[PDB]
Coordinates of C-alpha atoms in Angstrom, one line a residue:
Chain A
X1 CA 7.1 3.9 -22.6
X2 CA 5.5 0.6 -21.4
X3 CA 3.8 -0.4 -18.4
X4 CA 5.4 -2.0 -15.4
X5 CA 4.2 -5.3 -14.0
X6 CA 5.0 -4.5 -10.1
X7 CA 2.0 -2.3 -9.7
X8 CA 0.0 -5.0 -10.4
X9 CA -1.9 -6.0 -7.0
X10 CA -0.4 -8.9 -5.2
X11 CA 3.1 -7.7 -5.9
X12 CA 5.7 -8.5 -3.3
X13 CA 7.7 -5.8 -2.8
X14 CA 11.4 -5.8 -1.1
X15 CA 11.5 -2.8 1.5
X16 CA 14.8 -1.4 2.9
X17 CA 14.9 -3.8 5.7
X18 CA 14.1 -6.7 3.4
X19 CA 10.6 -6.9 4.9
X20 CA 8.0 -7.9 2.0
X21 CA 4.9 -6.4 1.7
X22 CA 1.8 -6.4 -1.2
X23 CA 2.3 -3.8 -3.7
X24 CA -1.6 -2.9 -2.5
X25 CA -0.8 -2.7 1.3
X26 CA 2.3 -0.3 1.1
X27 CA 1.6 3.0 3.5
X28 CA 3.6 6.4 3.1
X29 CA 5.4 5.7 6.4
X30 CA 6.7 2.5 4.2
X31 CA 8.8 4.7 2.4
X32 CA 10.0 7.2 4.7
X33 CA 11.7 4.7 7.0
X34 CA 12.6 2.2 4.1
X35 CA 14.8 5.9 3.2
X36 CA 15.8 6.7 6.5
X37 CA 17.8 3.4 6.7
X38 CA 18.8 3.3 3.3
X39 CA 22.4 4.9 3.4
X40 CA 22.7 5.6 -0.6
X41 CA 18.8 6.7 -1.0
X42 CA 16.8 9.7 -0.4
X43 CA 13.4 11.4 -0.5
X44 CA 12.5 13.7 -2.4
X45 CA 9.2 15.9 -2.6
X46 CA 7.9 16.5 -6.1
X47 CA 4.8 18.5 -5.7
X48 CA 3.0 19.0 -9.3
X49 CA 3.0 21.7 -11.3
X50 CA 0.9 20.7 -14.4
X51 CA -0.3 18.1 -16.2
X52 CA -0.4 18.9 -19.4
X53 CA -1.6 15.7 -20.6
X54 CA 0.1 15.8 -24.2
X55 CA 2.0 14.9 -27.4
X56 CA 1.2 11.3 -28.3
X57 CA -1.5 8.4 -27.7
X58 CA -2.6 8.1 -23.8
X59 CA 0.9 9.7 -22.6
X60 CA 1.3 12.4 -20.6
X61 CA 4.1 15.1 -19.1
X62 CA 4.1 16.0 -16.1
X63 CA 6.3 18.7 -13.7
X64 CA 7.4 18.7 -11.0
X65 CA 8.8 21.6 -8.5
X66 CA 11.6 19.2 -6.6
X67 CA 14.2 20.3 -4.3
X68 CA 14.1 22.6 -1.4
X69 CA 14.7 25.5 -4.0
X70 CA 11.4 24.1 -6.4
X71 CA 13.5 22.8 -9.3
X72 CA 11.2 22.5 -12.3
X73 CA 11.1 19.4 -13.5
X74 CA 9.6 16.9 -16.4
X75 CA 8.3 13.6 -17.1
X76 CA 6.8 11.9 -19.7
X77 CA 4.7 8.6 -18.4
X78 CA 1.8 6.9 -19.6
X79 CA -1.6 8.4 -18.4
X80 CA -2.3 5.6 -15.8
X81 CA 1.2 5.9 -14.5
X82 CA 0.8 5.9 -10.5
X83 CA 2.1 8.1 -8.1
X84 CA 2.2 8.1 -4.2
X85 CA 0.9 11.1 -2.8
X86 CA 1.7 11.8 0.5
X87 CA -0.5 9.9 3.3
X88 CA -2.7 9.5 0.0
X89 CA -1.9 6.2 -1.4
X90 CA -1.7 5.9 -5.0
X91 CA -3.0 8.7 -7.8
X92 CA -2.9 9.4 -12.0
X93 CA -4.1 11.4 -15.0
X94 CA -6.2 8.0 -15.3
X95 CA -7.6 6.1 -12.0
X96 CA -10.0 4.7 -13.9
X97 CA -7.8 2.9 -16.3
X98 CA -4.9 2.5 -13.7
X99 CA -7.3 1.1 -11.5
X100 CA -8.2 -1.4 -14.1
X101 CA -5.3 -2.9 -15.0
X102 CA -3.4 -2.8 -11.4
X103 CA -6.8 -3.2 -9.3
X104 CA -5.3 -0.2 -7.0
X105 CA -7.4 2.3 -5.4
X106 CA -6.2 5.3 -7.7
X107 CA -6.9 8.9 -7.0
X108 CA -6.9 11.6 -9.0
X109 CA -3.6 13.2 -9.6
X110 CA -3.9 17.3 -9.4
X111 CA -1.9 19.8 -9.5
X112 CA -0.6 20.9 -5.8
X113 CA 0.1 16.9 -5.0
X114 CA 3.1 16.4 -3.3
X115 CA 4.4 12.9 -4.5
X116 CA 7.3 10.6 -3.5
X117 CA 10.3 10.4 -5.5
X118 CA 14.0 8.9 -4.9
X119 CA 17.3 10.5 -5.2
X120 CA 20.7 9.5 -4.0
X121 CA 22.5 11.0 -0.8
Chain B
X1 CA 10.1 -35.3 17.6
X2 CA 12.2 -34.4 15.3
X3 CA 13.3 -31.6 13.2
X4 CA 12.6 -31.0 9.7
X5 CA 15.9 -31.0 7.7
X6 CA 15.5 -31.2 4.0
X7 CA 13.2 -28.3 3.6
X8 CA 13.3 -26.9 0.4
X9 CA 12.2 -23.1 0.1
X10 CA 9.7 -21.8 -2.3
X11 CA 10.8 -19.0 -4.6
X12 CA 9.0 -15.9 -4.7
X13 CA 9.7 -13.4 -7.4
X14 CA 10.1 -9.9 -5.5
X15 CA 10.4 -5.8 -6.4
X16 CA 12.5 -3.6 -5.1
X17 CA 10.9 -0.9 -3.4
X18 CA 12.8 2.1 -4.6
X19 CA 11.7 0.3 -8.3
X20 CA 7.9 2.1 -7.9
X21 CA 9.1 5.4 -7.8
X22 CA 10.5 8.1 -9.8
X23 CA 14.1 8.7 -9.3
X24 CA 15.2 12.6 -10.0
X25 CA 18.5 13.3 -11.7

């Protein structure tokens, strides 16, 4: 997989509203009412359930217990792939490399961090 | 006084939000 260019700092990002905001400036509250006023979108919890950093070159997989029930889940994203952690900002299996590249104050990403993901309903 | 009529906009290059996030499915 390759890295995305809209975590890059200075990013304008469309919320639900249309407001624009700095990829760097967006809050957890950002996303919760850009869902709540999206009719097709949807929230989703996706707390962590390991990281076992794996397989191939600087790639990692990572699960996930989504859903109200704890649906276990997978993903397989490059180790400075960012997450937003709830009223935590950004976080990765790298934030010293994603922090590089992106400039983005990257936190650790552990097990037991409940991150944002989308979903339609 | 007068209005400004002929303004051209500037074009700014924008991400969606629900773009930054994993969707589940």
């Amino acid at each position: 997989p390759t890295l995305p260019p809209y975590f890059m700092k200075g990013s304008i990002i469309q919320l639900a509203n249309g407001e624009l905001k700095k990829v760097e400036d967006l809050k957890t509250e950002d996303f919760i009412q850009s869902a709540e006023i999206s009719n097709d979108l949807k929230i989703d919890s996706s707390t962590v359930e390991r990281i076992e950093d794996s397989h191939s070159p600087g790639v990692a997989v990572i699960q996930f217990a989504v859903g109200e029930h704890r649906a276990q889940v997978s993903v397989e994203v490059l180790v400075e792939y960012p997450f937003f952690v709830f009223g935590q900002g950004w976080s990765s299996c790298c934030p010293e490399r994603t922090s590089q590249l992106f400039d983005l104050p990257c936190s650790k990403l552990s097990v037991g961090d409940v991150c944002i993901s989308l979903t339609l309903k | 006084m007068f209005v400004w009529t002929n303004v051209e906009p500037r074009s700014v290059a924008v991400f969606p939000w629900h773009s930054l996030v994993p969707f589940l499915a």
